[PDB]
Point group: C3
Chain length 188, copies 3
């Protein structure tokens, strides 16, 4: 088995189905950014400690879901031989329940917080912002091609999950969040 085929050496790559695209095509960029997020989630999970073990399984579950999203991003809406398989309903509800629970448990803020704290909380803020970068890429693709809009819904919700989980990670080690000193009351 050779994972290097060399077929990409001139700048084109195969997507799902027959088409080849330049590697900078917005479709390739979209699922490539999802893959970068997925790798960062793996890195974040590797930082789990005894205080934060309760977050481990759901990070692995998110990795599984990000593969399901990437599949659909790699699939043209008019490819007769392949169809969209990601459905947002249940995964997105699942994220919302976590967001509600973690928002309830941590100390309430009205103001923006500095993205930081523990190493794990900080990594969850990095995940938050890479998710949002991948979301931008997905919207770029959406403006040119038909996509599975359920992926967008889920990826939008996912960055709120990472915010909530980052605060929960600080709570699990009793690290206080720090406020942005010039913040207005923005959370209502």
């Amino acid at each position: 088995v050779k994972i290097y085929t060399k077929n990409g050496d001139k700048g084109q790559t195969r997507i799902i189905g027959k088409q080849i695209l330049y590697k900078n095509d917005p479709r390739v960029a979209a699922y490539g950014e999802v893959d970068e997020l997925n790798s960062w989630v793996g890195y974040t999970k590797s930082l789990i400690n005894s205080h934060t073990q309760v977050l481990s399984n759901e990070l692995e579950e998110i990795q599984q879901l990000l593969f399901d999203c990437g599949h659909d991003l790699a699939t043209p809406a008019d490819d007769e031989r392949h169809s969209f398989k990601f459905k947002q309903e249940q995964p997105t509800v699942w994220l919302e329940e976590k967001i509600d629970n973690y928002t309830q448990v941590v100390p309430a803020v009205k103001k923006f917080i500095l993205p930081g704290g523990t190493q794990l909380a900080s990594a969850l803020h990095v995940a938050r912002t890479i998710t949002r970068r991948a979301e931008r890429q997905i919207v770029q693709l959406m403006r040119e091609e038909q996509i599975n809009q359920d992926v967008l819904i889920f990826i939008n919700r996912l960055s709120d999950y990472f915010f909530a989980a980052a605060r929960y990670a600080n709570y699990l080690e009793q690290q206080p969040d720090m406020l942005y000193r010039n913040s207005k009351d923005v959370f209502r």
Copy 2:
């Protein structure tokens, strides 16, 4: 409080003031990249150790400043109800004084260095390059819309700060920098 409004689920988001933009709009991308930098700075600060404690407070101060920059990037120059609040003078002087001090104290190089060393020094090099990525985004926005040019000045200077601070972090643990083996003398 629900941080998930779902109003972003179709790919548009609210900026400062009345306007909504696509999430891939260059303005949204610019302050989104600043937020990614800010999160990375949080992560970097979480790596502080007893040798490097002297760097902790100024990283937190940079996080505060990055919120002030992001505010102005999110604000249209013609929005009557909101105005630019970031002024570069004092923060940028403050960075320059750190850059001068840290450049003086560490072993002099003429050649490019490998970006690495200690975990903290390496993270400061990652911060250096994410700052430069955010700067590119800010210039993309500048070419289409009027911006607070003071944010650009500060963000330019900030990546030189991260270079200087990365070298200082290696110095604080007595980790030598490594040279790029084919470098010309580039620092003059």
Copy 3:
């Protein structure tokens, strides 16, 4: 020595040779993304432990090679005073030999794996995906300007190297890889 010249404060920067470009120009973006990768490789190397010491030297060698690639990306193909110096043959063979060896030694998969595991393996997956992001940037530049195509070949191969090395890092700590649960058999 002042690394801050302030000449970049209005959004333009000097490349190799006489030209100045906007900081968001695709050329500047391409070698800037290579620099971000290089910094991440430095960070990854800082995570080496006693189990993974055998990977340290080759990560440093990759950093040297990434400077050689960045040089050529910063050099216009028609700049009479500067020429391309990167040749892919030997570095790319060297990567392929590592990929072959590491593919042979680790447990065989047919299915996609979750990008994660140990902290080092996870960082090598982050390197994999940042390499692929830089590759996209390089292809963007290739579509507008003549480049040294040897850089593209090497950067393509490099992300397969990081995949193989990430799996090898997990093997070195006897951390099993996890499969994507809905994967088809994709590695043939």
